[PDB]
Amino acid sequence: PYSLGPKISDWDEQRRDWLKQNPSFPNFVAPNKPRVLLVTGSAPKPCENPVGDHYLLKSIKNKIDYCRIHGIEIFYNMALLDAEMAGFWAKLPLIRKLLLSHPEIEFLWWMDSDAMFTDMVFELPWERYKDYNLVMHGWNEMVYDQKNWIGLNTGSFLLRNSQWSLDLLDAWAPMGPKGKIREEAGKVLTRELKDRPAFEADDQSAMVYLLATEREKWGGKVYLESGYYLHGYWGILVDRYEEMIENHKPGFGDHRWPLVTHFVGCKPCGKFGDYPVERCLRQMDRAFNFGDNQILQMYGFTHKSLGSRRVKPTRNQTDRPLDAKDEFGLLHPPFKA
Amino acid sequence: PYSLGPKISDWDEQRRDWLKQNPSFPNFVAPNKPRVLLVTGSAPKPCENPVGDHYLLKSIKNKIDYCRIHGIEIFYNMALLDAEMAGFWAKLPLIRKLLLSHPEIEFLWWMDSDAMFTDMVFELPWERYKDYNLVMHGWNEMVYDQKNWIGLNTGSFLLRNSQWSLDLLDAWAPMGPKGKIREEAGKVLTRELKDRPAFEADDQSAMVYLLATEREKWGGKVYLESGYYLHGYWGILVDRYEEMIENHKPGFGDHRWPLVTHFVGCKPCGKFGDYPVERCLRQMDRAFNFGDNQILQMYGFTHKSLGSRRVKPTRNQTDRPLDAKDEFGLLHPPFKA
Ligand SMILES: OC[C@H]1O[C@@H](O[C@H]2[C@H](O)[C@@H](O)[C@H](O[C@H]3[C@H](O)[C@@H](O)[C@H](O[C@H]4[C@H](O)[C@@H](O)[C@H](O[C@H]5[C@H](O)[C@@H](O)[C@H](O[C@H]6[C@H](O)[C@@H](O)[C@H](O)O[C@@H]6CO)O[C@@H]5CO)O[C@@H]4CO)O[C@@H]3CO)O[C@@H]2CO)[C@H](O)[C@@H](O)[C@@H]1O
Ligand SMILES: O=c1ccn([C@@H]2O[C@H](COP(=O)(O)OP(=O)(O)O)[C@@H](O)[C@H]2O)c(=O)[nH]1
Ligand SMILES: O=c1ccn([C@@H]2O[C@H](COP(=O)(O)OP(=O)(O)O)[C@@H](O)[C@H]2O)c(=O)[nH]1
Numbered sequence A, B: 001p002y003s004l005g006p007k008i009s010d011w012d013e014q015r016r017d018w019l020k021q022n023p024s025f026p027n028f029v030a031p032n033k034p035r036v037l038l039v040t041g042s043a044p045k046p047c048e049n050p051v052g053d054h055y056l057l058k059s060i061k062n063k064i065d066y067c068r069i070h071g072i073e074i075f076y077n078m079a080l081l082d083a084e085m086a087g088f089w090a091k092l093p094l095i096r097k098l099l100l101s102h103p104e105i106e107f108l109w110w111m112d113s114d115a116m117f118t119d120m121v122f123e124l125p126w127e128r129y130k131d132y133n134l135v136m137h138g139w140n141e142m143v144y145d146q147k148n149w150i151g152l153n154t155g156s157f158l159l160r161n162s163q164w165s166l167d168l169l170d171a172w173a174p175m176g177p178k179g180k181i182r183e184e185a186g187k188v189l190t191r192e193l194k195d196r197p198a199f200e201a202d203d204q205s206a207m208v209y210l211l212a213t214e215r216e217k218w219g220g221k222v223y224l225e226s227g228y229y230l231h232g233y234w235g236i237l238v239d240r241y242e243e244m245i246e247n248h249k250p251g252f253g254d255h256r257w258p259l260v261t262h263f264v265g266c267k268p269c270g271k272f273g274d275y276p277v278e279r280c281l282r283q284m285d286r287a288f289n290f291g292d293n294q295i296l297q298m299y300g301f302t303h304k305s306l307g308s309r310r311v312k313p314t315r316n317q318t319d320r321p322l323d324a325k326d327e328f329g330l331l332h333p334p335f336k337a
């Protein structure tokens, strides 16, 4: 029987004592700002199609820029800690190890390599989650009522460092072990969940199943967020970037300017995906430039067009660089107190 | 005539006034710890060599880990800000823009994309440079007396945010503009420098030519460091990694455990390097694993060998993860207090 590790039951007590002992590493970097670690990664070998690595590179730069502006540290995993938890399941052993290794972390923010920040201004409403331990983009009706396999998304979520999360991780991993375990589990998920195709068990479907069947146990501390695009399905967003630039401005994080554009199904690192490769890559270029225009804007540049690698100035240079106006206050934001 | 921008003559005064008006953004994050922005970059298009992008990805993860440990922020540039300053000259306009845009930065630490951290413990001796504005790996005699084009290295250097640095950039760019200017200046460098082959002018050779021919004006504020490998020629390091693991420990930063392994001449991304690609890439894998071992060992893992992507546990899991601090205290080091 697979296990993520030796059972721990007093983790909240171990954290409490550790923080008391090490006040130089508080779990809240500011009155209402918890210490956050964004976690991502990818397989340690080159992508089967070579350009896949290039889009992982653009992806990590994108996360670097957002995290530098919002004062959150990054960890990029390139190792498989548990041979039985490969693929999308590999983030469960990783998350557990980082939680136990960094008790100063209050929230762990996992983000897929195919997800990209498209709103550089938007800051997460931390106080909205002060009484919850797991935050995912989704809808209650889709998860608990319809049991729809896309009622939530596990490519961008927050997990609080607590005993509740360690147990949640244990209740989530059983369908992960590669082979017959994961295959037979997929048959269950396709049968019990709505609209789910037939394939091996994935971490997202397992979360829906767990929450739909054990709501009394977990639902109280799970926050299904649908007010902003903590996760944003690319298939309905990338085409509207021009409309967003024309009518709106960064900071909304929702349908007016999504926080995250997640390219579910594109698989730029594998050989085939669920969508045309041409559309996937061209729209990944557009999403990257959509977010990168907000970075270059601080420095007086912008991409010639949303699909061009080339940039152009947005204003003449000056011998008085400190008088310029930072439109969205990202050069010296309050997130870097 | 080429110019990096409108002439600024009172930057030291502008910066001081700004710092006084913005105490929340000090230029020293702690006593003798200057605020540092590490800056790297690569061309916006996929690598001519397809797998080259996979090694840019590994290189930036390596910098993420080191900078996370030592509390240093990262900027990853993918834009050609000035069409004339293409190639390795692209860092001059980038460095100027970042210094003028971030007055809170005391030191800008440029680092090549083919340069990798192999000592995760070593912290630069900042106090040693309290009176200097430019820090490069090199030797006085080889630069000033011999005029050797490799007497110093511009792939890993510290540049202080100051009027002096702005003036240096003005005196450094003339040989940059692509075309007749760079090609002609290349002939000047091959004729005036020792052992330089024949090719277009490069930023490193130009720096040597400048400092050797104008030592009185610039030399006083330049520190040519050779006590540790701020720049480490891979050719004399990668073969010794296993010896270092046996005999020494991370923290020395020099011949016993180099801070930076820099794969000059390899061109993992471009083409037509000075060394075989196979030998280059396989040693870059070893260099990455040499550094990555120091990261993974915080969490109880290590690479099976410097040539294997697989990892193995260094110790059994435990229900008391907060009793054994890491061997070098990098989980909670003083750089993040
Ligand atoms: O761009 C288009 C054109 O490119 C041309 O190709 C160029 C290429 O552009 C360029 O990037 C490349 O530049 C690198 C060379 O490829 C590379 O071989 C060279 O390696 C240097 C290394 O940089 C340097 O650090 C190292 O220095 C030694 C030094 O030799 C030695 O004296 C010294 O010894 C010390 C002892 O170790 C120490 O114990 C004692 O205390 O002090 C001694 C010194 O006093 O140790 C240092 C190392 O620490 O030497 C190696 C070998 O030279 O670095 C170059 C810069 O990155 O060059 C290519 C051309 O060759 C194409 O040719 C053209 O077609 C294209 O159009
Ligand atoms: O070996 C692996 C496989 C995947 N991932 C990460 O887990 C996420 C989700 O895995 P998935 O199989 O769903 O790939 P996706 O289609 O989301 O790109 C990936 O984006 C990667 O960021 C990883 O770190 N190591
Ligand atoms: O279009 C480009 C080409 C290069 N570089 C950067 O300039 C550096 C030049 O260093 P390189 O390794 O190519 O020269 P070498 O060290 O081999 O002599 C690269 O590493 C990149 O970091 C860049 O920013 N844009």
Ligand SMILES: [Mn+2]
Residues within 6 Å of the ligand: A112, A113, A114, A115, A155, A262, A263, A264
């Ligand atoms: Mn994904």
Ligand SMILES: [Mn+2]
Residues within 6 Å of the ligand: B112, B113, B114, B115, B155, B262, B263, B264
């Ligand atoms: Mn280099």
